Design a protein around this ligand. Structure first.
Ligand SMILES: O=C(COc1ccccc1)NC1CCCCC1
Length: 289
């Protein structure tokens, strides 16, 4: 009991500093302490009950600055604290957590498209580079299942990608997995039961409502019910066995829609609206303040 869906940052006209938390048990939203620096294209994650905001870019009136930052929000204090910065700025980053360690994957720095990957140790407040991916990927979706890290889709600067790869920590090695059926960058990628889901994104021509899932045993990708709304640069998380997608861009509107996927019925429903439409958020779940 008591867990909220936290959304940090995002983009609407400029990068945003908002931190807001949704309570699925009562439909309420809380506005919490703003990020110290506005950021879009970031990722969120949780370790030890603390919320982390990783990477991104500050698109502001005065400039566009890619972020190497890691910042930590403690729901007990409603305060953000800086942590050690990454080796490199990473906008349009993907993040996953393995056994209490944060992996920062890919992303962009100016015209540079990273294949590099680094790992944060919260107790030591240190980052260290690990093996790079086999592919340069920005707008990459990342998720962790069974202590293996998956990097899904993205953009290498020339083509959006249907490819995906898996990192095996004990060997510090990446291997390609079966590619998705659809090219996607800026998809929401998460884990639910024994599958990696890729929802939405941009294929180079259109924002997508399709959703497909990779079964890590059978190595297949299967489409599930599509979302009601096409969206790229959406936030995603999982809570109590359901997927939540937040915001994004549909080619017309920065969406405020939050949809929820029930795997038992293979259906999506609209569960709430964010307080304002935005794309490029970071999202994670932890205890309420
Ligand atoms: O939301 C963002 C930044 O975060 C992104 C995250 C993943 C992929 C792409 C971007 N930029 C918006 C600019 C205006 C057009 C819609 C995307």
């Amino acid at each position: 009991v008591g867990r909220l869906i936290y959304t940090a940052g995002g983009y609407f006209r400029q990068s945003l500093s908002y931190l807001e938390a949704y309570n699925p048990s009562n439909g309420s939203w809380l506005r919490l302490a703003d990020l110290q620096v506005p950021r879009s294209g970031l990722a969120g994650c949780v370790v030890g009950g603390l919320l982390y905001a990783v990477g991104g870019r500050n698109n502001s009136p005065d400039g566009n600055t890619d972020s190497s930052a890691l910042d930590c929000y403690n729901p007990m204090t409603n305060q953000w604290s800086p942590c050690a910065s990454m080796s490199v700025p990473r906008n349009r980053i993907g993040v996953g957590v393995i056994d209490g360690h944060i992996y920062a994957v890919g992303g962009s720095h100016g015209c540079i498209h990273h294949s590099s990957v680094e790992r944060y140790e919260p107790e030591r407040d240190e980052w260290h580079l690990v093996a790079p991916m086999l592919t340069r990927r920005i707008g990459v979706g990342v998720a962790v299942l069974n202590r293996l890290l998956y990097a899904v889709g993205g953009f290498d600067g020339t083509n959006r990608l249907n490819s995906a790869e898996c990192y095996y920590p004990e060997r510090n090695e990446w291997r390609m997995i079966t590619p998705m059926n659809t090219i996607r960058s800026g998809a929401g990628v998460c884990v639910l039961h024994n599958c990696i889901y890729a929802a939405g994104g941009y294929d180079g021509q259109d924002q997508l409502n399709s959703v497909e899932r990779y079964d890590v045993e059978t190595e297949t990708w299967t489409f599930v019910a599509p979302m009601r709304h096409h969206r790229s640069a959406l936030g995603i998380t999982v809570h109590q066995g359901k997927i939540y997608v937040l915001g994004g861009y549909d080619g017309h509107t920065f969406l405020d829609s939050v949809e929820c996927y029930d795997p038992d019925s293979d259906t999506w429903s609209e569960v709430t609206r964010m307080t304002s439409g935005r794309s490029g958020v970071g999202v994670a779940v932890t205890m309420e303040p």
